[PDB]
């Protein structure tokens, strides 16, 4: 009855998956904790099982990772880069099948599953070059015969907790960077994407083994809130990268701060698109559609708020309805499907409640609003008009495809309305106005980590630092100098002179 | 009976101080909170009085500061740099009397009082150039017809809480950097250095007023824990910079994390000096003495642990004892004086407490240990031998001139002993060995924020970032790219092309 | 007869100038060369005399500067910055009288003379901060137990040759940066702004001498081509910064290259403004006027070519003509004056030559074209229409206020026309079109070193690197990392390990 | 008769080489110039033939390359990065056979031939990441409502002239960087390594064609001085990267400067090793040996001068002699061989002239000095004692394994003797003294581009910039910000405000 036991899904075995899998890796595979079964959200059929980590598994693994660090930190960064390069190659080799597993277990369409694996491949190739660049300036000291240098060194063990919706790429961003920076990693992924976590870890383990390196450099401990909390409280976890809900991230940030650890928090978003009167509507409508319904509206960067100037509000909404109608719904492995299921049945309940609250708070559902009558967690992509910008439900992050549409008149108020929410991840304006664009990028503009112009809220590449402000948590991943969060700065003064300090009256020697 | 009403202390009037002073500035001067009297640690005499901030004062001031930010943030960074240049000049003009005030109210010797003002002056001149440099890279987008830019913008209001021991320079580091970065500031200094806070604020207010700027850009609200806690919990304080005890700092960090604010923590030190067998003893002995007894052992970077290789241990300890007896003690403002009083009577009590605690834990006092029989809070600079490196009183930070001396044999164990404590601020080795130096600076070396060679634990200049790791709190001030902590990063993608996105099968337009 | 002997010009004495002045400084003042008398171009009267350098003067000065470098290079960069800070303040205290001398002897209006001194003051304050920042990265070596560092050190003697039209700021830019970079300097200014060179050097010399530093750190050797040629041919001149004509710059560059020296060339411009059909005309017209007639069209960055879309050509021309007629002409120290004399009588004749050449090539003078009926070197600001964009006189740099106006139809051809000339200094477009703007800034856009949008060709501040491409010479001054041209990069590997190389079958030791 | 026609050398066909090969590539293969035969330096047998470029081939190729640029410059840098990544992979696939060709045609031993290919592979991988990093800062304008940005854009066509001794890696450094920076390339390699140039170009040509890119993006024009001179004089060659003799390079520099082009010169070396009294002699002797005789003394970074403190001089020379005696001499592809032939018979003749000149100037040959009686261009590795540091022959670069040895006593004189030569490429000291090491690295130390400590003169990796000063030419290749030499800087001010300029008394509109 497991999908992995059906010949139709034999390709799963190309990732080294079996009926029952070990969810702990530290150089050896094991798992003494609870056995979890994960399910395909397109049909709710069981795929396979994973043995999760017990506390003893976690203890053993942290210790092994920290012993492996002693070897790893001694390897020159460029040589660490070479390992990361080989990891990218090993992912390249498995990209289609790993992409298919992401579609199967998580629920996003295949091109996005493959695309997410390509994202990890790309950050590896990036990190290879960065591994030859990381460090700090030699500075001119004000003291004669002294050197002043800024050094960067690994923090040690980087704990990585990731969410269901990007079960490969977020880990990848943290892993490739943390690795070239001389850290070891311990991964705890979302329980409902356990097979994906195991499959990626099998790919990396083989590269470490072929290079005769301890596997615990990239440790895995599958588990849920129990293991996540242990990492948050563990002094041996020097940096904890956490991607997930704002509510959980807040508690993780507190626990880390309590022990003077470091945390990197990538939390929820309430991302807005603003369309000004002068905007190219041929650009706005498709941009809005794909940002809003992409991944069934389950991206951290999903467009959840659409502000449209009064003069064009009715036309844009009309064109958006006409476009939603053409969204192709199906299984996420079905070719040319644009739109798959929500990740859990719970997310469907959150969807419905949201649509109910919207209707009751005075909103009108101009499209969607219903559960589709079919197997799996499918809901109609939804557009809601008529709500006030400060409506309770619109300030809430609901991880479903519901787009709240508002009218505005002036630039200052709608910039304010962008900024008024608790989250601070991504934002976008559509306009041709040179002046407005630079105000939006300036000190009185968007308050978000991602501030886009004529591209929707999901526009982001690995070259820049990725992350948000406010309740989004403040962490950055991937590009620019995000690498610094994974290392510790020292300011080092070196007296190379035979000079003595002033005696100040005192008779020395 | 107030020192400011005696002719010998008439110079205080040059700083704009009188018998009773307003301790709130927000464009106007005020203060409706409790009136505090500050005392000269050299003779335990009252100097003058300061009216502190009430809750209402605090509320009004935060509001005015945030209103002034609307103006200040619109002022181009280099023009903001020009104001900071003028603050530097106003400081130059008062450097002698302000330096004297620092000696009088805080109790450090006059050249360090003056030296501290010079520090503020120096960061001003530095920030001037920086104000034409702050920003991020334009990066190459992977997308045709798109630009990708990293922007930096002010966070808004920077709350600055400072300690008694550096009552001018810490605020200055924060102030000059936060100012050129486009933020307004709110200062709450240590209550026992209130006159210093008022005097500095009077200098800055005159520059702001003279430039027709709202004075609230550099606001002051004198108070103790109640105002500090208010700032820690205040969502309107976008970044809180805190310098003070690890115990208080931990609670401030938690309160700020609870509200997803930003904190910059500069906390305790337990700094070690390590002398290897090949060290230049003629460099070691004076370096150790000055970093141990400087400012009566009340610097954050004070040398409190001294590791000496066993072959040279007794010779270093004997020479240090002979050097300690030549320390010139007296009034801080008196010339040739090297050693003044502790800041408070409580500090003296802590001093005695620690000395008895060390004897109880098996320590031997080889010099000092007692209170001096004279006016003021004077205690003997103290040397203790025989403790184990992991003695509890050795791991505890006592803000008193006590130096714990330990033997070691080999490099790996003593690097580990440097790193074994909860604090992570400063560290120094004295050695000639080229290999040892680069291992000290490396991943298996010192874990401190400041890592020095052949210069003691107070070695640090403007050009580098200043701060520590672990329970020191992780913040950085002054140099390198510490400015980034006072600003928010946005990653901005601009589509300037007429290219429409892929329709993906949908019929738009 | 000499202006300096007339009571109305007694203010010249405040700069330390007399009837006959020493034009050589190297710690001592002297000059055994040709005596030159400089003239006011506003009334063609002699101002005062300068004794120029003989060959023996130049020889002695080079040797003294290079001796002085031994001391100067040993001063830590931040302390070099303090000298430059003090130079900044010394210029501040003399800014009005110095700016007045620039107006007197060179002929630009008072606000530009004063402004040029402010420019030197500003780069000083910039350089002070930079002096704590210059240097390179510490990079991660691929070899275990090795450090890899990029060091920067002074080149030695920086020869600086400057032009008549910016007799203070160009030197100032080079001086401030070279100085904090640990170089010594040798200045040869234009013979016709000799008093300005002597006055600037008197101010710097006092600062150096007051700091008990050898004056030859900032040497002056006034002279013409013979002194300049000697600098170009002199191996002891490690870097030669040349600002002047393309014709001479080419020969200077070749001579320096012949001896494998370093050159920094800032040569001519043929700068264009392009106004597209969507441009804000109320921005275009005054931008063009002030960029065309400012400094009587004698800036390297002066707008000489004006391209206007066919649809708005006649209107912009008519509005420019109406605006030129209101330009106020007079003595450059009169504050109502926007417009001063040309620098020489030869320049007036060449103005006439170009006008006549333009008419010969088929052009129409729509405004001006004539010498003005008054004492001094005054000509009418001039507009020429109807020339082809590849007319010879339009591709010629004439240092006179003649603006050549062209029609254009489309973007691609007008970008090509901007780029078609030999020079490559500055360029500007006026447009609202987002896409056009980023194409202009991109690879198929302007080929100049300064590339502006909605601001004319004279738009430049100290924060960025200043200079051009192609026949403008390639050098950069002032901002960004222009400082690297004044220093030598070394890539340094330090083996600090006890490891021995592989024996490769050879029995060593 | 041709080696390529022998079955033992059948592997050469794996590089797609045949009896007669086309030596021009621009998307098409051709060559109407003279047919050159290249010879194995180890036995002087002909290998195969290459048809070189006529003038017509060159002209057409430059035009096709510049056409190709219009497409290439429009490709986003990260995507150009992806092409370079694939080039690295294609090189990987042929690393053994390509390396074997390098040993065969050029004559360096196998591990270095393969090593050279690996070098190109590594810079490709580095360039991949850099292609998402290149660009400049956004800077804070002093002007309200203005943006100030530094842009970097390709120069266009980069001509690359390379030398015999590194027939793969030097081109690869230039190629990988130039390509990600958006330039197209035109390669003219040394005529005596033509088969190598063709073999490399075949590999790249396939990658471009598989990606449907025009092949002229990486163009090849095989030829001698006539094609090189043409490139130096050609205004269409925007940057000329020249690697080769100081003699030729001087003329290339002058030709490029004459037309105001850009040049990047990598010229001769006269590299010193300096052994101080405290040096690790087990470290010094093999470091000296391998750096002196490596690649038969034919590296630009080859150690040619050895300075030894008088106290250890005879000991090191004796130990060096005994080690030279054990150098294994033979065919460069032979696995056990350390030492192969010089590249040409002319090189053997120059070697002989240098040895005879060293004797006539009073040197003593204490090891080697003779041509070896065997097939090929073999000479004995040679050591010469007794010359003064300023002997003419020692100041001369003879591209042969001749090591000039000198005594010295003190640091100051020996730093000067390192610096006194015209060349400025690489330098090394061996010492343990901390003070000496940082002095060496400072302003009074080595004047070379590579400045090493306890590692020989050939110590360099791709992470840092590679090149030298003085007569070595000034150019840098590979790491750090060397990429900037392949691009043009623009400083761009964007006025996005509605603000009009001040009227200054003029009535507009």
Swiss-Prot record, chains A, B, C, D:
Keyword Mitochondrion attributed: yes
Enzymatic reactions: nonanal + NAD(+) + H2O = nonanoate + NADH + 2 H(+); (S)-2-amino-6-oxohexanoate + NAD(+) + H2O = L-2-aminoadipate + NADH + 2 H(+); betaine aldehyde + NAD(+) + H2O = glycine betaine + NADH + 2 H(+); an aldehyde + NAD(+) + H2O = a carboxylate + NADH + 2 H(+)
UniProt enzyme class: oxidoreductase
GO CC annotation terms, alphabetical: cytosol; extracellular exosome; mitochondrial matrix; mitochondrion; nucleus
Enzyme Commission code(s) on record: 1.2.1.31, 1.2.1.3, 1.2.1.8
One Pfam assignment: Aldedh
Residue sites binding NAD(+) per the record: 162-164, 188, 228-229, 244-245, 266-267, 397
Reported tissue expression: Abundant in hepatoma cells and fetal cochlea, ovary, eye, heart, adrenal gland, liver and kidney. Low levels present in adult peripheral blood leukocytes and fetal brain, thymus, spleen, skeletal muscle, lung and tongue.
Assembly behavior: Homotetramer.
Protein name: Alpha-aminoadipic semialdehyde dehydrogenase
Organism of this sequence: Homo sapiens (Human)
Source lineage: Eukaryota, Metazoa, Chordata, Craniata, Vertebrata
């Amino acid at each position: 009855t497991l999908l992995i036991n059906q010949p139709q899904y034999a390709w799963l075995k190309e990732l080294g998956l079996r009926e029952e899998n070990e969810g702990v890796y530290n150089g050896s595979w094991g798992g003494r904790g609870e056995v979890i079964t994960t399910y395909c959200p397109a049909n709710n059929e069981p795929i396979a099982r994973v043995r999760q980590a017990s506390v003893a598994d976690y203890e053993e693994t942290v210790k092994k990772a920290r012993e492996a660090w002693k070897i790893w930190a001694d390897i020159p960064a460029p040589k660490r880069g070479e390992i990361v390069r080989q990891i990218g190659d090993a992912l390249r080799e498995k990209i289609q099948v790993l992409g298919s597993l992401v579609s199967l277990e998580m629920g996003k369409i295949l091109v996005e599953g493959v695309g997410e694996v390509q994202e990890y491949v790309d950050i590896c190739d990036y990190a290879v070059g960065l591994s030859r660049m990381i460090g700090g300036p030699i500075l001119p000291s004000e003291r004669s015969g002294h050197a002043l240098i800024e050094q960067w060194n690994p923090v040690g063990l980087v704990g990585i907790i990731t969410a269901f919706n990007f079960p490969v790429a977020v880990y990848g961003w943290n892993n490739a960077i943390a690795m070239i920076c001389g850290n070891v990693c311990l991964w705890k992924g979302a329980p409902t994407t356990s097979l994906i976590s195991v499959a990626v870890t099998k790919i990396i383990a083989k590269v470490l083994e072929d290079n005769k390196l301890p596997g615990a450099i990239c440790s895995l401990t599958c588990g849920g809130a129990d293991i996540g909390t242990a990492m948050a409280k563990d002094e041996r976890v020097n940096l904890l990268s956490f991607t997930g809900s704002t509510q959980v991230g807040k508690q993780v940030g507190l626990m880390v701060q309590e022990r003077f650890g470091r945390s990197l928090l990538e939390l929820g978003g309430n991302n807005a698109i603003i369309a000004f009167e002068d905007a190219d509507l041929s650009l706005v409508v498709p941009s809005a559609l794909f940002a809003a319904v992409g991944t069934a509206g389950q991206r951290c960067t999903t467009a959840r708020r659409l502000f449209i100037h009064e003069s064009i509000h009715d036309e844009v909404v009309n064109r958006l309805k006409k476009a939603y109608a053409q969204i192709r719904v199906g299984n996420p492995w079905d070719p040319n499907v644009l739109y798959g299921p929500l990740h859990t049945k719970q997310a469907v309940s959150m969807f419905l409640g949201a649509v109910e609250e919207a209707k009751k708070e005075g909103g009108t559902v101009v499209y969607g609003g219903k559960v589709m009558d079919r197997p799996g967690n499918y809901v109609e992509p939804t557009i809601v008009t008529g709500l006030g910008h400060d409506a309770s439900i619109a300030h809430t992050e609901t991880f479903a495809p519901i787009l709240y549409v508002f009218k505005f008149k002036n630039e200052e108020e709608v910039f304010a309305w962008n900024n008024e929410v608790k989250q601070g991840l991504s934002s976008s304006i559509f306009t041709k106005d040179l002046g407005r664009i630079f105000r939006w990028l300036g000190p009185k503009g968007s308050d978000c980590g991602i501030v886009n112009v004529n591209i929707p809220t999901s526009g982001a590449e690995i070259g820049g630092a990725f992350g948000g402000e406010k309740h989004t948590g403040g962490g950055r991943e991937s590009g620019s100098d995000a690498w610094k969060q994974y290392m510790r700065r020292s300011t080092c003064t070196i007296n190379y002179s035979k000079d003595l300090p002033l005696a100040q009256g005192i008779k020395f020697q």
